[PDB]
Design an enzyme around this catalytic site. Structure first.
Site, PDB file in Angstrom:
ATOM      1  N   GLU A 169       0.829  -1.204   0.000  1.00  0.00           N
ATOM      2  CA  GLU A 169       0.000   0.000   0.000  1.00  0.00           C
ATOM      3  C   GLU A 169       0.862   1.253   0.000  1.00  0.00           C
ATOM      4  O   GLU A 169       0.554   2.224  -0.699  1.00  0.00           O
ATOM      5  CB  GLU A 169      -0.946   0.006   1.204  1.00  0.00           C
ATOM      6  N   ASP A 216      -7.974   1.413   8.040  1.00  0.00           N
ATOM      7  CA  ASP A 216      -6.634   1.981   7.930  1.00  0.00           C
ATOM      8  C   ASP A 216      -6.425   2.991   9.050  1.00  0.00           C
ATOM      9  O   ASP A 216      -7.351   3.718   9.416  1.00  0.00           O
ATOM     10  CB  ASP A 216      -6.427   2.650   6.555  1.00  0.00           C
TER      11      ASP A 216
END
Ligand SMILES: N[C@@H](Cc1ccc(O)cc1)C(=O)O
Ligand SMILES: [Zn+2]
EC number: 2.3.2.5
Length: 329
Positions: A169, A216
């Site tokens: 990511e 997240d």
């Protein structure tokens, strides 16, 4: 079919009553998650590192020990990077792979690359070791209920559950369109070009994604999650309602409604994260990222000591209720 990809538009939760909510709150263990799921991930684990391998094995071994019929797939691919061609590996854990529809929970399991500084190492506690551990604890705490999804001659689910742990990511440098979201850009394109269910003429794995719930930067005190998208707003409102009812039943710790996590406010801008390659292909997204980011974001202080245990415990309860209500379990 071919109207089945429209079912997500009309899907309603099966709402848990007070007795069931107490059962879910009692059935998750923040201390067990801390010791058994989180601490093994609080390691340097940038893509291609020994820690990335160790983190992947840990995630797989914790899922494999559960009774529910999880199917693990490692999605390994090459990508160009600022440091040349490199290999990445997403982890996908799926209940009922041939079910047409899945609710999808996801996070990233890589940690951002940093050279060691003053003998300190970046472990990305909120970013996103805690999201990883929350997904593993959800799988463990709901294991008996998720086992009932198992396909037998009597029941074959239309809708089931999938977990995705994205690699890569983070940018290797600072964010750029080509240096970030390696695993999600790859997997979204792969799912978009894979027929689903098997044998389908005109529908993809992306059409089967009911909702992508992306966790997240979770674990800091006092997070506030905005309601980012109109086509998932009704599910954001369910998180609000679950939080409110767990609060009123006395099932949350060190929690006030004035300081609630799911607040009545939107966010107009774009946050770059693993949902973007799915969102831009039409997947509904519930983006559970706080705004503002944790104060420790992308510093060496994003560590275990700065995590807020009771906030993570509260969010585990809220998320587990959400998933059960979505799946009618
Ligand atoms: N990274 C984005 C979104 C963001 C939102 C809240 C923050 O605290 C930080 C960043 C900017 O622009
Ligand atoms: Zn980050």
């Amino acid at each position: 079919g071919p109207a089945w990809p429209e079912e997500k538009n009309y899907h309603q939760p099966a709402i848990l009553n007070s007795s069931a909510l107490r059962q879910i709150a009692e059935g998750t263990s923040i201390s067990e998650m801390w010791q058994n799921d989180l601490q093994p991930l609080l390691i340097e684990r940038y893509p291609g590192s020994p820690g990335s391998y160790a983190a992947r094995q840990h995630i797989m071994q914790r899922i494999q020990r559960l009774q529910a019929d999880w199917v693990l797939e490692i999605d390994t691919f090459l990508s160009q990077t600022p440091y040349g061609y490199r290999s990445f590996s997403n982890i996908i854990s799926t209940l009922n792979p041939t079910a047409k529809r899945h609710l999808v929970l996801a996070c990233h399991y890589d940690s951002k690359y940093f050279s060691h500084w003053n003998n300190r190492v970046f472990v990305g506690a909120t970013d996103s070791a805690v999201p990883c551990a929350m997904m593993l604890e959800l799988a463990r705490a709901l294991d008996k209920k998720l086992l009932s999804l198992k396909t037998v001659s009597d029941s074959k689910p239309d809708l089931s559950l999938q977990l995705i742990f994205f690699d890569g990511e983070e940018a290797f440098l600072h964010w750029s369109p080509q240096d970030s979201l390696y695993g999600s850009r790859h997997l979204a394109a792969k799912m978009a070009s894979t027929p689903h269910p098997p044998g389908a003429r005109g529908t993809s794995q992306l059409h089967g994604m009911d909702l992508l719930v992306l966790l997240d930067l979770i674990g800091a005190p006092n997070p506030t999650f905005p309601n980012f998208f109109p086509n998932s707003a009704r599910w954001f409102e369910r998180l609000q309602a679950i939080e409110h009812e767990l609060h009123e039943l006395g099932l949350l710790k060190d929690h006030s409604l004035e300081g609630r996590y799911f607040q009545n406010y939107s966010y107009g801008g774009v946050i770059q994260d693993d949902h973007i390659p799915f969102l831009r292909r039409g997947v509904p997204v519930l983006h559970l990222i706080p705004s503002p980011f944790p104060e420790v974001w992308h510093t060496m202080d994003d560590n275990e000591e700065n995590l807020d245990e009771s906030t993570i415990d509260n969010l585990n309860k809220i998320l587990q209720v959400f998933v059960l209500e979505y799946l009618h379990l």
